[PDB]
Write an enzyme that holds these catalytic residues in place. Sequence first.
Site, PDB file in Angstrom:
ATOM      1  CG  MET A  40      -1.890  -1.339   1.267  1.00 13.99           C
ATOM      2  SD  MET A  40      -3.163  -1.226   2.286  1.00 13.99           S
ATOM      3  CE  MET A  40      -4.297  -0.656   0.934  1.00 13.99           C
ATOM      4  CG  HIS A  44       8.020  -0.509   6.200  1.00 11.21           C
ATOM      5  ND1 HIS A  44       7.900  -1.919   5.979  1.00 11.21           N
ATOM      6  CD2 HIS A  44       6.464  -0.525   6.475  1.00 11.21           C
ATOM      7  CE1 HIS A  44       6.870  -2.451   6.293  1.00 11.21           C
ATOM      8  NE2 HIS A  44       6.047  -1.560   6.418  1.00 11.21           N
ATOM      9  CG  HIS A  47       6.586  -2.622   2.174  1.00 11.25           C
ATOM     10  ND1 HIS A  47       6.367  -1.386   2.811  1.00 11.25           N
ATOM     11  CD2 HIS A  47       5.354  -3.311   2.010  1.00 11.25           C
ATOM     12  CE1 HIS A  47       5.162  -1.278   3.013  1.00 11.25           C
ATOM     13  NE2 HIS A  47       4.504  -2.367   2.763  1.00 11.25           N
ATOM     14  CG  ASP A  78      11.447   7.754  -0.278  1.00 13.78           C
ATOM     15  OD1 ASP A  78      12.414   7.475  -0.578  1.00 13.78           O
ATOM     16  OD2 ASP A  78      10.940   7.314   0.973  1.00 13.78           O
ATOM     17  CG  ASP A  79       6.584   4.525  -1.679  1.00 22.02           C
ATOM     18  OD1 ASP A  79       7.029   4.680  -0.649  1.00 22.02           O
ATOM     19  OD2 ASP A  79       5.136   4.486  -1.685  1.00 22.02           O
ATOM     20  CD  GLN A  82      12.156   3.210   0.409  1.00 21.07           C
ATOM     21  OE1 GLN A  82      12.644   2.332   0.919  1.00 21.07           O
ATOM     22  NE2 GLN A  82      11.175   3.885   0.722  1.00 21.07           N
ATOM     23  CE  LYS A 150       1.826  -6.768  11.573  1.00 23.60           C
ATOM     24  NZ  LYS A 150       2.331  -5.990  12.570  1.00 23.60           N
ATOM     25  CB  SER A 186       4.456  -1.385  11.762  1.00 24.09           C
ATOM     26  OG  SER A 186       3.265  -0.529  11.726  1.00 24.09           O
ATOM     27  CB  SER A 187       4.332   3.036   8.241  1.00 21.24           C
ATOM     28  OG  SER A 187       2.952   2.358   8.236  1.00 21.24           O
ATOM     29  NE  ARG A 188      -1.578   0.981  11.982  1.00 18.62           N
ATOM     30  CZ  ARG A 188      -2.516   0.371  11.940  1.00 18.62           C
ATOM     31  NH1 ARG A 188      -3.011  -0.209  13.320  1.00 18.62           N
ATOM     32  NH2 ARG A 188      -3.652   0.280  11.353  1.00 18.62           N
TER      33      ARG A 188
END
EC number: 6.3.2.1
Lengths: 278, 286
Positions: A40, A44, A47, A78-79, A82, A150, A186-188
């Site tokens: 999504m 990070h 991924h 940025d995605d 990467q 995860k 996690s992005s969280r």
Amino acid sequence: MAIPAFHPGELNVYSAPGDVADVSRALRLTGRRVMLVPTMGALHEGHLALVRAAKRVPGSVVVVSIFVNPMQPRTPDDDLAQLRAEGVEIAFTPTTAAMYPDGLRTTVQPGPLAAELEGGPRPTHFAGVLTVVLKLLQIVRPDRVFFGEKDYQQLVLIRQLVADFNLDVAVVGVPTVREADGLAMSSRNRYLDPAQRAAAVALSAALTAAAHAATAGAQAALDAARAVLDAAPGVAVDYLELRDIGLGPMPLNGSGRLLVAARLGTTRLLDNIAIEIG
Amino acid sequence: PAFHPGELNVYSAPGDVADVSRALRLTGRRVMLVPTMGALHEGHLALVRAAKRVPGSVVVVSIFVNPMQFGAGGDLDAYPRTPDDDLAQLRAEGVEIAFTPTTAAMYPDGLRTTVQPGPLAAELEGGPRPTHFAGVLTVVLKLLQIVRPDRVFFGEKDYQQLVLIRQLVADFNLDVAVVGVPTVREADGLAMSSRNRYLDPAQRAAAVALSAALTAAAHAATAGAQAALDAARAVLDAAPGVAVDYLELRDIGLGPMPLNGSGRLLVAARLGTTRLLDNIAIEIGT
Ligand SMILES: COc1ccc2[nH]c(C(=O)NS(=O)(=O)c3ccc(C)cn3)cc2c1
Ligand SMILES: COc1ccc2[nH]c(C(=O)NS(=O)(=O)c3ccc(C)cn3)cc2c1
Ligand SMILES: COc1ccc2[nH]c(C(=O)NS(=O)(=O)c3ccc(C)cn3)cc2c1
């Protein structure tokens, strides 16, 4: 008639489902083995581990999809950088309208597992995930599709999708990437304040403790995990459950999975681990 | 498994038909799928013949009475099963593959992940049968994934089913072309159906009213939608022992849009205990 442009060894970006379908089909017919990594976006290290696993397959061409499913945090440039850095040759970046040109209509209804665990607070979440995963699988027609361990319940539901609808793809689960202290990526995680971030290690610590306690049996494993979570302030546990590897009832001995979810302030964290009883 | 061209090869295991189909596709043959619930009649054979017309085709006919599209009440047990006639017919037609899976092979885990159709599934045939089309779409999705055909063939007789199958294909991005084949009819107009065998002589005679009403409506339609519907109603009303369940004139996609110039008129009616369906294209005005 003509296949959309594709340049080997470069990052080719397609927003149209038809374009990536045609390019994927063409690549397959040249012998390449199409790998799909659904994301999504807001990429990070988790991924990237999926990407690296896909790249290891000989003859692989890697397709990374980036799509925020409204049915189930967006840094586009940025995605892509990467992915270029990882040697990914295809990024598929459709709009909501491209994925759902006729709106919400035919969808996937998961089995009863989707109402359990994460499906408690979010009873339609997995319907959304399985619907978009099915669509991506049909658009791309990969030989293998890669998911992190995860989101373990998600992974199990995907395996149910594949079995139940007779899909020909191989589903590959990739071990969870973790921070230095064990916190699952996690992005969280960046939303946690220092006290919360310190407390958050209790999830992975509880699970690893349980995995080693398991020589003394299922109850010892569960009690060890609970004890570790009980040592953390501000960690509201939603569930801590030991299940078989397919998320049915844990058998008397053999292999299982221990899953935990907790809220820290407003942030929900998940973790899980393999367990072998005895 | 083995495959012998120019003969009927029968496979029961999904894996066997899957391997054979993929192998054939990789050698350049285009794979056609005709999914059926058996009890084959000339309507099914029209599908087979259409499939055969595709150059370089290999035709796969599936025969499976799908338990998922029936509800409790004896309908599943009552569905006509004529295994020997079915296979004899396929041989006569030059069909090279019959896929005849078992219930256990198709549903080893019982009911688990299913297809949820859109709102059309709750209308017309689906109104009193809330999971019927979910059942249909689920088995059709599985057959499509097992066989991976280039084209799949359906009759226009079960028009609502056909529309929902097009929805399935579009909505899930399936790489198959859906080919709808116009309804084969008996000489008097009665649409072919595996249920026609349940009409006694009086009911068979009365049953012509469905096609007569539809064809009357199609010609009445130069005078508008009311004229069309009223012509059909009149024919149905004049028919002894025809109990109409619905008669509806809709847009061609049966979807959430009003009738324009192109419509479909659908009827369902009971003759004794036998429920018959028919439908026809309607053009409104001139
Ligand atoms: C290999 O080790 C890891 C470790 C952590 C990981 N996180 C994700 C991930 O988040 N993927 S996502 O973006 O497609 C997504 C978003 C939301 C919801 C609910 C599920 N999935 C992959 C991953 C892999
Ligand atoms: C081309 O002219 C025709 C005329 C009549 C036809 N009937 C069928 C048919 O029955 N197909 S089925 O076996 O897949 C089926 C059975 C039961 C229910 C409810 C839906 N579908 C095909 C067909 C073609
Ligand atoms: C009372 O009116 C309704 C209205 C909607 C409904 N949905 C379901 C339902 O989905 N049941 S299911 O999940 O066990 C299922 C799904 C798919 C297939 C083919 C068979 N069963 C029942 C039901 C009843």
